[PDB]
Amino acid sequence: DPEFSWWEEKLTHNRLEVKTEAAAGVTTLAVDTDQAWACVKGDILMVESV
Amino acid sequence: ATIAGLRGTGDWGNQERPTDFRETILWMEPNGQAPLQALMSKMSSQPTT
Amino acid sequence: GSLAPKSATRNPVKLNNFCQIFKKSYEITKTADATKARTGSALANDKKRR
């Protein structure tokens, strides 16, 4: 055909940003829109540093 | 990202999913007892100069 | 002895392009074709240039 197409896919980290400050002892965190869908039960998340 | 845990026919890209097609044309023609060129088939032929 | 977790997935991105028509023509008289030139045959030289 005079018009042709292709598909590309990237592999990326599972990175979340906490919008609302949470103190120690809080079991619920607020993240950016639709970011929590990637995570499921059993994932291990760790706070990152500069 | 889809979390539903079940990929379905709806959970695909814009043109990732073509449907099914029958790759031919079904033709309709006039029907009758005589051939299509009825007058011609019941006719003689002779050359002209 | 735990149970298996939930599942998730994603989709790629799409790109496309077009095709273009190119034309380049050469013309010569038959008399000039029949003649002999030191530089060689004129038609072949015109074909190479174009």
Q: Which single residue is written with the structure tokens 């539903």?
A: B4
Q: Which chains touch A (3 or more CB pairs under 8 A)?
A: B, C
SS3 for C30? helix
| CA separation for the pair A22, A45 (Å, rounded) | 15
Q: Residue B38 is inside which H or E element, if any?
A: helix B38-41
Task: Write out residues 1-50 of C within 8 Å (CB-CB) of A.
Answer: 5-8, 10, 12-19
* C28 in Cβ contact with C46 (< 8 Å): yes
Q: Catalogue the E-assigned strands of C1-50.
A: 13-18
Assess B34–A contact: CB distance below 8 Å, yes or no: no
Interior angle at CA B1, CA A41 and CA A44, nearest 5: 30
Q: Which residues are within 8 A (CB) of A34 and not within 5 positions of it... i.e. 6 or more apart? A: B1
- CA contacts within 13 A on the Cβ side of A38: 15
Assess C6–B contact: CB distance below 8 Å, yes or no: yes
Considering only the beta carbons, identify the residue of C6, C10, C14 that sits closest to B1.
C10
Q: Resolution of this entry in Å? A: 2.8
Closest CA to A34 of A50, A12, A19: A19
